[PDB]
């Protein structure tokens, strides 16, 4: 079968504006799925059926500890 999900899950804090053809457009509220990260400045992860470079500074690591 299939057991143990493994890459990191970054939220788009805001829209995005890639430049480049090879980096991923994303919307603010957006799931990224951040496997390779050898680039702190560009990080490499699927968001939308896509697979782009990402910057590592308009997502970040989600945290949010909810009880209710």
Same mark, same amino acid.
């Given at each position: %079968?299939?057991?143990?999900?493994?890459?990191?899950?970054?939220?788009?804090?805001? @829209?995005?504006?890639?430049? @480049? !053809?090879?980096?991923?457009?994303?919307?603010? %509220?957006?799931?990224?799925?951040?496997?390779?990260?050898?680039?702190?400045?560009?990080?490499?992860?699927?968001?939308? %059926?896509? @697979?782009?470079?990402? !910057?590592?500074?308009?997502?970040?690591?989600?945290?949010?500890?909810?009880? %209710?």
């Amino acid at each position: %079968g299939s057991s143990g999900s493994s890459g990191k899950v970054f939220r788009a804090l805001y @829209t995005f504006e890639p430049r @480049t !053809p090879d980096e991923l457009y994303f919307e603010e %509220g957006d799931i990224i799925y951040i496997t390779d990260m050898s680039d702190t400045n560009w990080w490499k992860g699927t968001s939308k %059926g896509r @697979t782009g470079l990402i !910057p590592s500074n308009y997502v970040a690591e989600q945290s949010g500890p909810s009880s %209710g």
